[PDB]
Amino acid sequence: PIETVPVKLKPGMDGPKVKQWPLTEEKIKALVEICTEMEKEGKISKIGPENPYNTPVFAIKKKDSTKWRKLVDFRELNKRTQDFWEVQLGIPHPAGLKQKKSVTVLDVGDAYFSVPLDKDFRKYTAFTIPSINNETPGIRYQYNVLPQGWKGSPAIFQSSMTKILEPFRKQNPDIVIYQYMDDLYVGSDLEIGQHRTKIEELRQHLLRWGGYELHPDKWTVQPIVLPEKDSWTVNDIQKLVGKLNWASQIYAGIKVRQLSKLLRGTKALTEVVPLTEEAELELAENREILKEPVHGVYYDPSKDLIAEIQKQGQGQWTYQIYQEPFKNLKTGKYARMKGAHTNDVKQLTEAVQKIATESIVIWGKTPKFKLPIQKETWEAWWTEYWQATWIPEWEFVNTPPLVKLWY
Amino acid sequence: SPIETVPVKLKPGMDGPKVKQWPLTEEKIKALVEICTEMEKEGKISKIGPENPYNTPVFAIKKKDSTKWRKLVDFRELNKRTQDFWEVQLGIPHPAGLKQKKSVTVLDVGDAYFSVPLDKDFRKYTAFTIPSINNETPGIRYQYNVLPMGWKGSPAIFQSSMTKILEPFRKQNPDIVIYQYMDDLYVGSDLEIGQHRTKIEELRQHLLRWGFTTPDKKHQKEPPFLWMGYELHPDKWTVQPIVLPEKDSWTVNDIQKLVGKLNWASQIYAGIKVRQLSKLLRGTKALTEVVPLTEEAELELAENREILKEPVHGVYYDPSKDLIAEIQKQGQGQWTYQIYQEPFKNLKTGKYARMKGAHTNDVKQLTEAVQKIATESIVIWGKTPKFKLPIQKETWEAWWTEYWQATWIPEWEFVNTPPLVKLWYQLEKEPIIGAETFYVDGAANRETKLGKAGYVTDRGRQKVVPLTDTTNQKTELQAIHLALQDSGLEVNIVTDSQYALGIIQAQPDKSESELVSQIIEQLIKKEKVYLAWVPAHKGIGGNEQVDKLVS
């Protein structure tokens, strides 16, 4: 019973037309019951084929919450939706979130279900539920309400959200709340138990109007490391010189001329070469330059974030987050702790969720990922391990390791 | 039908079609005043006049009844000007996805599209003219009041209407399975034949209230049921007979037909191959170009015929048992698989033979086949099967540990059905003691098309070979080729080609490139090979000597 906000697509752009991919039995059943209940509650409406738009839909199951959660992949629609920094409905990101001792993520998408959506935009939110063995044609719905996962929902619901959080943030000035899409990131410096307690109080406040724990203090940066030996082969110095030569694109004043001078002549790779005093000097200097962070690299909120990932083996994955090439805002190393140790695709999916989560906490948005995986391998399995209510942009790359920079 | 119409529009700025009819014979146009009069009596069409400026040509083919005719309209222009639709038909049901049912019925709706009304405001665009007397008089013209056959919006609107009409019966009878494909209804149940026929009569009455007739001619009551190109028996299902073309002289189009038929047959006939027959289609220029069968294509065809003359059947799905998919390697990037639950009782079969990428290996292609089978299994049965694969656990472990991209295969067990899938070589992680060290390099001139490839070695050996009509990357691969050619069983190799290192380090066993194929040959024949990279033009070790030598 509220007046809707007029929203439109970006000029010269049409709505999303993305095909539905196959779904397992359990996901289809979950989506059927969820969409049935949403249909009875008026949140969605059944539509026909004269609506030419579509967006893929699937379902996830958080490990700590055994109830299914519907997830619509509105990435295309969000890319085609108007920006809201012109309607002044954007969300400022607080710099204090990444300093907090603990940060709990909360799914507050259900709030969006209390605000109607512009009548002339609803057709862009259509989605189709598939059928096992194609027993029936797909079942099409569209939203009558601010949808979960749509970028316009946090912008339109902003005023409401601030009005609902005002008392809690008033009673707790040193707890930080940052809304990203359907999520609230809640950071505090106090001890674990009372932190979870205040999270419970926050919950009951939200529940009354209408538990994923992170530790940013534990996020370290993994720099470029040089090996340390007593005797060095020709091969060791070739790989060292190549590594440092690549590193001269990122850092400043890195020399190779003396270490490289050691290699004069056509020498056997296994032949041991003694290190010149001047060459040892060069190795110590370059080793020190890599120890301290690079000078002159700053975040630019007008540009997108990009994340690269490399598989290192034995459950280790290195990553870099940058905006311009070789000017890394962050370098890191993800490692799984599940014990099973035998699924590359699961580990990479979890790594993407963790990296994107850190990007939300630090900068307020997710980066576009360059994934070291075949497109079809990723698309065959990634939904089986996804746990976030948001989905980042990604592309697929095949670049073997020339040198092993990050390990 | 009293069903509510579906609003449809033309694309923005577009108008209706204004084309002309063909050929205007008194046999033809008297047949055209013959066919329509009954449709007008039933209300499917209405006469219109010159104040309607649109037109579209009409024709007719013969139905598989072989006595009844099917009226079609060439709506290509109108279709181009009609709004887009989102198609609700996402795939094709498969008999291997059916469960055993006590009682089965197959029904078809009579004149299905003509039972669904068309949007009033849109009807003016479906106008078709039939000349009165060979253009000697204004002319008789009609417009459609129902869904036309040939309009791109008709199938989706009919499917949606049928879904809405069936929904009440579905919700009221959850224990009755209704496969709905266009106007073809499969209806299975675990009821006794009496109450089953009661529910069938109720369903037909429900359809008739909404204007969907179910003629007895298309009402199947006893097995074998003809359904979606298959024959359904109580315990098994078969494909309807597949007749391969038999020609003395083969054209491109004949071979295309043959390959298509063999692909259709591969869903239940195990071991079908089409690689050699499909190779005949490559490089051809016309559909009527005569193509002589190679020896390999004749052998492959004969093997397929031997397979096809043996009777086969699939069985139905038991959800209380596991799905099992077993894969075999057939050679030259060809793979065949069977999906079953009890041994020697296939639910279905299939094959995978796509060449993805310029350079690949058997492990990658086996992974691709696994992914195809997984997707197909999710479509048909809603779950992923357990795999039996001809690859050792050690081979897979080695591959996914050494390879740099993330890869995975779900729960699988090793099955010993040679030829097994294996890695054909492995590059050493450390340099080899006592092995010769080759510093290789190749370079080409892009304007000139000339290049050179050579090496310098730590034992004093050097070589330079000229190359014509080449590229940069080709000269680098050529340098590696030379090093592998002139070295012993064990060799260390140093290059500056990130490209060549990238290809070789992925351990390919096949390639669309002759040069890469030769390199693969040489690598398979070696005993130990260590391959290393250095940056170019930095005056490094032997790399500077060989780079100086090539120039």
Ligand SMILES: Nc1nc2c(ncn2[C@H]2C[C@H](O)[C@@H](COP(=O)(O)OP(=O)(O)OP(=O)(O)O)O2)c(=O)[nH]1
């Ligand atoms: N444009 C077009 N539509 C077709 C064609 N074949 C089938 N359809 C569509 C239109 C049909 O109404 C619908 C059902 O196929 P049917 O073979 O059952 O034809 P229909 O029901 O109209 O006549 P019937 O009483 O079953 O003999 O599917 C075709 O060849 N061209």
Ligand SMILES: OC[C@H]1O[C@@](CO)(O[C@H]2O[C@H](CO)[C@@H](O)[C@H](O)[C@H]2O)[C@@H](O)[C@@H]1O
């Ligand atoms: O995995 C990429 C794959 O996803 C699709 C839809 O399934 O596109 C989605 O992902 C893209 C990559 O980020 C987005 O650009 C796009 O907006 C989103 O819908 C396919 O297009 C693509 O093949």
Ligand SMILES: [Mg+2]
């Ligand atoms: Mg029919």
